[PDB]
A paper describes a structure:
WW domains organize molecular assemblies by binding to short, proline rich peptide motifs each with ~4–6 residues. The type I WW domains bind to a consensus ‘PPxY’ motif (where P is proline, x is any amino acid and Y is tyrosine, also known as PY-motif) with very modest affinities (with Kd in the range of a few to a few tens of µM). To achieve this goal, we determined the high resolustion structures of 7 representative WW tandem/target complexes, and measured the binding constants of >100 WW domain tandems or isolated WW domains binding to known or previously unknown targets. In this study, we discovered that WW tandems, but not individual WW domains, can bind to target proteins with extremely high affinity and with very high sequence specificity.
Numbering used by the authors:
A (entry chain U): 879 to 895
B (entry chain A): 4 to 131
Write the structure that this text describes.
Amino acid sequence: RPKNMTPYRSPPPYVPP
Amino acid sequence: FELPLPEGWEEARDFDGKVYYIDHRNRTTSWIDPRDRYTKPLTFADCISDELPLGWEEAYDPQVGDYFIDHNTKTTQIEDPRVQWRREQEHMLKDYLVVAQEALSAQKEIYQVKQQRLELAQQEYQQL
């Protein structure tokens, strides 16, 4: 990987209806 | 007509427009379409040909270019994981070939130690 490697983006937080 | 989201699930869009999936029953979210688990191969072994297994994505970023996202391990990488997998399988068989060579070599040494011990037991015995 490079030094500016795009880090893992977790899915958005859970949110009720 | 498509297939429905399983019960308890909802689809939504992040700020950047990327689709994600909401599991209200377990109060979590996922980048992985819950219907993928019925279609996609589970591991790189089950793939044919170019398909990515469950929880893997292609992505792009102007800084880095094309890369791969693994939602299973929550990591990202540049290297094509299908290529990496084929490479890993060859390395493992190589490794097994090498430890077989080393095991054989060490047993040859043991065998020779044992014939030296036989000679010494012979000497000790023929001293009567």
